[PDB]
Structures are given as structure tokens and as C-alpha cells.
Amino acid sequence: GRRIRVQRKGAGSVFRAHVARRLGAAKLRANDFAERTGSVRGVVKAILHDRGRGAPLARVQFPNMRGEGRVNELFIAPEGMYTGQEVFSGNKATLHIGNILPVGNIPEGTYVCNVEEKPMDRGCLARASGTYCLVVAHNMETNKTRIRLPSGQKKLISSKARAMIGLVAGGGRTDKPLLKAGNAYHKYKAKRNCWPVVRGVAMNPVDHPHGGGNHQHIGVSSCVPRNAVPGQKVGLIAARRTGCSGGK
């Protein structure tokens, strides 16, 4: 046979993300001495649309603390943030929607977004439109805090990791049908080359393990083991069960 679609994707070429006309990487403000002691004030300048992304981005201007002038940031906007609003970051930031503060100072039961797994990594956990995390409990003896992820799993992170109050803006996007093939075309034209999708049973044996036969059908079981080598891992990988169980 020849190389499969999954094997060809990993080599780049016509399978790279289309990044032209993107505003940049969205991140929390970097951690420094000024906000390790007090608070730093900024102002929201604009709210913009990012190609490929479902959630809006906000441009926030802060004073420069190692010289003269100003510093421009790029945040993921929580719901309810408006142009001209002033926000704070630091150990002494107040509990308002746009503010950034460490999770140790956030009361249990609060909604947070753009949480950082390890201190000083600039956010990585709740970044897609409509998502949020919950602060569950604190442990002052070990200095660790428990959170609940959008998938429902529970994780322990250090109490010095920062987050933003609120939930990500743009919630409800997936409640509307795409309806037409032309809509999915535009959606994926803003992201990467991955659409439309040809079924494996509709191919010839030379280019997929599912192809061939006098009727269209999968010859064997579709569950493959975890240790299958790269050209073999197609179908359901290491599935614990299959079918529509119906219960919890």
C-alpha cells in the first residue's frame, strides 16, 4: 500500500494552519515585581474578531514599568467586558469580572477562565468560547488548590497560579446548525485543510485498511489496541466500550 491520510498530515505541506491576518497569540500578562507586591492598572482599548477563533479578543494597555511609554497586551475577553473599562492585575486586585489574581485569593465557588497550569505560564486551561473553571477548595497546609475543568475532571494546582474572573465570551455558538455544506466550507477555510472527509470503506485496499470488497464493509472489528503502529491505528483506539449505553 501507500501512506494514509493521517501519515501525510504530520509532514506539514498543505496541512498547516492558515495564520495570515491573525492578531497574535492570546496570553495573560507576564508576572513581574510590580504585581507580585501590589496591583497594575490597565484600560481596555478594543474588542476584536480573530480569524479561526470563536471567542473575541481584547486589547489592553498597561503602563511600562521598566522604562517609558506603554505596553499593549492581548487577552481572551470574558463575557461582559466593554471598551474603556479599567482592569487590575496583581496580588491585591479586587474581585471583579475582568481582573487577574492568584487562585489562592479567589473564594470557592467562583468562575474563572484562562487558568495557568503551572505558575508563570500565562494561561492554558479555559480558553474556548463559553467555557469556565470552578474553584472547589483550598489547602493551606500544602499550598494547593482544587479546580474543576470544563470536561468535568478535577485537578490540583499550586495556589500561586493566576486566573481571570468570569467565563469566556461567545457562549452558545454550537447551538445553531450550520445547515449547508457551504457554511462548513467557510468555517474550515478559516482554520486548516481538513474538510470534506472521505470514508475509508469507500476507498481501495491500497490506501486504507478499510477499503476493498464486493460490498462496502469493515472486514474485522473496528477496535484497535493502544500499541498499534502508526499505519494501523484507525477506527476506535483503545475503546473501553462501544454503543449507546443510555445510562449514567
Partner RNA sequence: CGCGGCCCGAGGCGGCGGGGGCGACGGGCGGAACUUAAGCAUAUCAGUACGCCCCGGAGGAGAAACCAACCGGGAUUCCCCGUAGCGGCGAGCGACGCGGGAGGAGCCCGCCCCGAAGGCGCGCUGUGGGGCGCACCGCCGCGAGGGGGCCCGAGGGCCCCGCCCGAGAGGGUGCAAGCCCCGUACGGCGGGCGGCGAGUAGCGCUGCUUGAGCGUGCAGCGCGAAGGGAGGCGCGGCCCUUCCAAGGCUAAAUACGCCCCGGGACCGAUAGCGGACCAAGUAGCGCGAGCGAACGGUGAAAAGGACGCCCUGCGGCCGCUCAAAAGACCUGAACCCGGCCGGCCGCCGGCCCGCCGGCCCCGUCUCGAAACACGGACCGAGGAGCCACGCGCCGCGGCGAGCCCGAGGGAGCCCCCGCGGCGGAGCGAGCGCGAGACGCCCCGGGCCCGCCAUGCCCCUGCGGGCGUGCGCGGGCCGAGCCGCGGCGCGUGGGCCCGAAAGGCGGUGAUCUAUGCCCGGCGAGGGCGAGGCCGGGCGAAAGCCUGGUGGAGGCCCGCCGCGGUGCUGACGCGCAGAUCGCUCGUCGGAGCCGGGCAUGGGGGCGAAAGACUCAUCGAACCGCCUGGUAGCUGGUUGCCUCCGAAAUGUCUCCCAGGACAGCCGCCGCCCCGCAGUUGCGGCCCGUAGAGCGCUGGCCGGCGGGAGCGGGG
Partner RNA sequence: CCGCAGAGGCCCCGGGGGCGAAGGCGGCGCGCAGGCCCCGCCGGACCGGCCUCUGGUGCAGAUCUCGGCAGCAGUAGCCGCUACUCCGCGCCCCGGAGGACUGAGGGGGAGACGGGUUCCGCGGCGCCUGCAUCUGGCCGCGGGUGACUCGGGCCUAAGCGGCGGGUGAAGACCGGGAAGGGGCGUGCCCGCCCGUCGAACGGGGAGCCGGCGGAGACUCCGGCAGGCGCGGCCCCCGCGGAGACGCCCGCCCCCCGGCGACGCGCACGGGGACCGCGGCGGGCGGCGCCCCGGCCCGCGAACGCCCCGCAGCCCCCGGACGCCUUGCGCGGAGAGGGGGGCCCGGGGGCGGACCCCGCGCGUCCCCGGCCGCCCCUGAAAAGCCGGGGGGCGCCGGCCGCGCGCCGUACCGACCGCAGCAGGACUCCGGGGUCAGCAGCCUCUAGCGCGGGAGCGAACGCGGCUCAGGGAAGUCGGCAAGCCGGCUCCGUAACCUCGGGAAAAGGAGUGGCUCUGACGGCCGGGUCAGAACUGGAACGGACGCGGGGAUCCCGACUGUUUACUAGAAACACAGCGUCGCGAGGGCCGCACCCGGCGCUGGCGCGACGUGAUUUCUGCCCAGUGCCACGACCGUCACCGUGAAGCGAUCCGCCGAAGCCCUGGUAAACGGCGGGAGUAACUAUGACUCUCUUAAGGUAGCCAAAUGCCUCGUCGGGCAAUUUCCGACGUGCAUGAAUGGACCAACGAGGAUCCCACUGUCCCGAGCCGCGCCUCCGCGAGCCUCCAGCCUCGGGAACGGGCGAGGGCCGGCCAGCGGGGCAAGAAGACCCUUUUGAGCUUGACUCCAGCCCGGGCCUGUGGGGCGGGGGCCGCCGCCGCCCCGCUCACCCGGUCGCGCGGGGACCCGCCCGGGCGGGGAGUUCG
Residues within window 42-71 making contact with RNA, judged by CB under 7 A: 49, 51-55, 61, 64-70
Hey, which residues between 196 and 215 contact K ion (CB under 5 A)?
197
> How many whole angstroms from its chain centre is CA 98?
19
CA–CA dist 156, 163 (Å, integer):
14
CA–CA dist 77, 127 (Å, integer):
9
- Give the residues across from 20 on adjacent strands: none
State yes or no: residue 242 binds RNA (CB under 7 A). yes
- The mark string for 150-189 relative to K ion (x by CB under 5 A, - otherwise) is ----------------------------------------
- Within 10 angstroms of residue 212's Cβ, the number of other Cβ atoms is 14
CA–CA dist 100, 32 (Å, integer):
13
Q: Which does 172 bind (CB under 5 to 8 A by kind): K ion, RNA, none?
A: RNA
CA–CA dist 53, 57 (Å, integer):
9
Residues that contact RNA, how many (by CB under 7 A)? 137
CA–CA dist 113, 162 (Å, integer):
10
State yes or no: residue 1 binds RNA (CB under 7 A). yes
Closest CA to 111 of 142, 71, 80: 80
- Indicate the residue whose CB is closest to K ion: 197
Judged by CB under 7 A, the residue of 95, 120, 137, 156 near RNA is 120
Q: Which window, 61-69, 100-108, 127-135, 191-199, contacts K ion (CB under 5 A)?
A: 191-199
Q: Which does 61 bind (CB under 5 to 8 A by kind): RNA, K ion, none?
A: RNA
Q: Which window, 81-89, 95-103, 104-112, 203-211, contacts RNA (CB under 7 A)?
A: 203-211
Residues that contact K ion, how many (by CB under 5 A)? 1
CA–CA dist 225, 147 (Å, integer):
32
